[PDB]
C-alpha cells in the first residue's frame, strides 16, 4: 500500500518534449522494496490547473512520499530543490499564455517551505549509481517551483508534514537539445535513459529511507 | 536623521579584494535627497561575528532602510536577492575556516524571509542610469545569504518589519578578475566605479521610495 | 607619419550599439608616443563591402600597424585573436541578410593567418593597467574573422607581412547588455569607458613595440 | 581492407578517465559497411610521443580515413574540429609536466590545416541518430589540436591529402564529471554509451562517404 507519487510536466515553451513526463510515464507502477509502488501523473504547465490536479492526487493517492519532477533546460546534471518559494514570477508565459510578476502564491502563508526529501541520501545513491548531481537552492519561480511550494503547503496544512516531498529538476534530453535554434547556445543534455534512471534511483532512495 | 545602513564584506577565499567593501567605504556619509544619510560598515566573512556585528548596527543605528551588499564572483550584472533562506550550507570555508552542512540558522523561525526593498523601483532606477541588473532568487547559502536572513529576522522580531531591507550582490571588480588563476575560466567583471555607482543608484531609489 | 589603423564595426543583429565603433570613434587622431597617430574607420558588418573598404584603408593609409576591433557579445573580457581562418560560416545573417556556409574566403590561399600583433606585450600592458584579458584562438567565422583574414592576407600579398596586424574583440557595453530580451541569459558587459581604455592601452603597446 | 584509424587519448590532468579512450577501445575492430574496419589506438597526452605514435600508425596502417578523438571537458555535445592550428600553447601541463607558450609546431609549414572529414555528412548522421552536435572552430592549442595538425600535415606531405582526417571532441563522461571537486562548477556530461555511439555514427558516416 505505500505509494510514492511521481509527477512530471507536459512540454512547454519551444520544447517539443519533456523528459520529466517521459520519466514519470516509464516508471509508473514500478514496485520498490518494502511494498512501495510508484504512482505517476502528468501535470500541465499552468499553475492553477497544476495545483488543482496535484491537490486531487495528494488527497486521492494519499502518498507516503512525493517526488515532483520537471525540466530545467540548461542544467547539466539532475538536481534536488532545497526550497520552494511562495512567489510566482514568470520569465516566459505558461501554457495558457499567462505571466505573473512578484505574485504571492498564498496570502498569509509561509514565504517558503524547505523540501522534506532525504536530500543527502539521494545524492549518495546517485553517486553510487555513477550519476552526477547536486542540490539546487532555487527552483525558479515558474510552475515547477509553484507545485513544490503547493505540495509542501498542502501536506503541512493536512497534518502530513512528515511525508517526504521535494522536487527533482532534470536536464534536457536529446529531443529538447536537438530542437534548440542554431543561433542559440547548445544545451547540456542527457539521454532519456539516463534521466529516467536518475529519477528511479532517487525514488528508490526515498522509499528506502522512509 | 533617517539612516540607510549600507554594509559590505571583507575579502574572502582567494579574492584579494571585495568590491562590496570598496563600495560601502566610498559611499559612507553620502547625503541622499530626503534628509537621508548613508552609514557604512564592513562585516567579516564569518556568520557568527557577522551576525553579532549586524545586530549591533541594526540596534545602534536604527536605520530607516538596510542595504546589505556582497560579492558574487561569476555573476555578470548587479542583482537584488529576493529571498534569504534560513540555512547555512558552505561550498567553501568561511574566513575562520569553518563549513556548515544543511544547518538551520534559527530553530523555530521561518524557513525564509522575502527581501522588503522596493525591488522593481531599484531595477527601474538602474535601467534609467544605463545599468544592467536583475532580481536573483537565490543568494546562495554562504555568509551573504546568512546576513540577509539575519537582518530580516531581527527586524521582524523587533517590530521593524516595515524597514525595507535586502541584499545587493555585485560582480567581481578588476582586482578580483585579475587574481583568477590562468587555468580557470575568466570572470565577468565591472570596474569598481561601475559597481559603486550601482550601489549608489540603489540606495537613492530605496530612500526615494522611503 | 607612422599611422596605426584602428577599425570598428557598425551595429548588427539585435544590437542597438557597437562598442567597437564607439571606441574607434573616440580614439581617432590620438597621438601616441614615437610620432604615431591613430586613424580610425568604421566597417560595415558585411564581408564584401568590409573587405573593399579595408583594402582601400590599407592601401591609402599605409599603416605601420593595424588594430581591427569588434564586438563579441557574451565574452567577459577583451581578447586578442590569435588566428584568422580562411572560411566564412555565418550563424546569423550579416547586415545584408546574407549567410555563408563553409565558404572559402579565397581559392588557393592559406587556410589561416596567425595575427602578427605583439600578443604578450598587449596582455602585459593590459594587466599593468588593471584590465583583465586573454588571447582567443577562434574569432568565429563571421565578419570579424573575415576582416582579420582579409587584412593579414592583403598585407602578406603586398610584401607588408611585417606590419603588425590583429583583432581585438570587446565585450558588450551597457547599451548592448540592456537590449537583451528578458527571457535570455544576461550578458557580461563593460562600461564603454573601460572598453575604449582597453583598446587605447592595446594601441599604445602595439606602437611602443613597433 | 580499407581501414579507418580511430584514436583516443589516455587520462590526463585531474581526470580519472578519458571517454575518448573508452570509445576507441570499444570500437576497435568494428566492421563497417563498405568493407571498412576500424583500427583503434590510444595516444599519450604528450605531443612528442603522441606525434611519434601517430606517424607510425599513419605509416603502418595506411588508413582510408582518420578519426582522432579526445576529451573536451566542459563541452555539452560532441563536436567536430574544423581546423588544426600549428601552435602549441598549453594552459595546463601535459602528462610529462611540460608546457609550451606560443610554440610553432613546424617551421616553414602552414599556419593551419582544415579538417578533411565530411563535416556536414557527420552532423546530419548524428542528427538522424538523435545526437546533438556541432562543428567547433577551435580545438584548443593543447595535445588534441597538436595531433590534428600533425596528422593533416603528415598526410599532405606524403601525398595523402585526399584521406579524410579530422578531430572529434567528446564531452566528459560520468566518471569525469563525478571527479570534479565540490567547489568547482558542475560539468556537462554524457553516459559513455552515448559518447561511444556518437563516435560510431561518425565513423560510419565517414566511410559511407568514403
Curated annotation (Swiss-Prot), chains A, B, C, D:
Q: Which cysteines share a disulfide bond?
A: none
Keyword Protein biosynthesis among UniProt keywords? no
Q: Name one GO molecular function term.
A: pyroglutamyl-peptidase activity
Q: What class of enzyme is it?
A: hydrolase
Q: Which Pfam families match?
A: Peptidase_C15
Cellular component (GO) terms are: cytosol
- SUPFAM superfamilies reported in the protein's UniProt record: Pyrrolidone carboxyl peptidase (pyroglutamate aminopeptidase)
Catalytic residues, per the record, are 81, 144, 169
Quick one: signal sequence residues? Answer: none
Enzyme Commission code: 3.4.19.3
Query: Which reaction is catalysed here?
Result: Release of an N-terminal pyroglutamyl group from a polypeptide, the second amino acid generally not being Pro
Q: Please classify the protein's predominant subcellular localization into one broad category.
A: cytoplasm
GO BP terms, alphabetized: proteolysis
Instruction: Kindly list the places in or outside the cell where this protein is found, as annotated in its UniProt entry.
Output: Cytoplasm
| Keywords assigned by UniProt, alphabetized | Cytoplasm, Hydrolase, Protease, Thiol protease
Subunit architecture: Homotetramer.
Question: What task does this protein carry out?
Answer: Removes 5-oxoproline from various penultimate amino acid residues except L-proline.
The UniProt family comment states: Belongs to the peptidase C15 family.
- According to UniProt, the name of this protein is Pyrrolidone-carboxylate peptidase
Q: Which organism is it from?
A: Deinococcus radiodurans (strain ATCC 13939 / DSM 20539 / JCM 16871 / CCUG 27074 / LMG 4051 / NBRC 15346 / NCIMB 9279 / VKM B-1422 / R1)
Task: Tell me the lineage of the source organism.
Answer: Bacteria, Thermotogati, Deinococcota, Deinococci, Deinococcales
Amino acid at each position: 500500500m505505500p505509494t510514492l507519487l511521481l509527477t512530471g510536466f507536459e512540454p512547454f515553451h519551444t520544447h517539443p518534449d519533456n523528459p520529466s513526463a517521459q520519466a514519470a510515464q516509464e516508471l509508473h507502477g514500478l514496485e520498490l522494496p518494502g511494498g512501495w509502488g510508484v504512482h505517476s501523473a502528468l501535470l500541465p504547465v499552468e499553475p492553477h490547473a497544476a495545483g488543482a490536479a496535484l491537490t486531487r492526487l495528494l488527497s486521492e493517492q494519499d502518498p507516503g512520499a512525493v517526488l515532483l519532477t520537471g525540466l530545467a533546460a540548461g542544467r547539466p546534471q539532475v538536481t534536488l530543490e532545497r526550497v520552494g518559494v511562495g512567489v510566482m514570477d514568470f520569465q516566459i508565459p505558461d501554457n495558457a499564455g499567462q505571466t505573473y510578476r512578484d505574485q504571492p502564491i498564498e496570502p498569509d502563508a509561509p514565504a517558503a517551505y524547505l523540501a522534506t526529501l532525504p536530500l543527502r541520501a539521494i545524492l549518495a545513491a546517485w553517486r553510487e549509481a555513477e550519476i552526477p548531481g547536486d542540490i539546487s537552492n532555487s527552483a525558479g519561480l515558474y510552475v515547477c517551483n509553484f507545485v513544490l511550494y503547493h505540495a509542501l503547503h498542502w501536506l503541512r496544512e493536512h497534518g502530513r508534514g512528515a511525508v517526504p516531498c521535494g522536487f527533482l529538476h532534470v536536464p534536457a534530453n536529446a529531443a529538447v537539445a536537438l530542437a534548440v535554434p542554431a543561433d542559440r547556445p547548445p544545451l547540456p543534455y542527457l539521454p532519456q535513459s539516463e534521466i529516467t534512471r536518475a529519477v528511479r534511483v532517487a525514488a528508490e532512495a526515498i522509499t528506502a529511507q522512509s
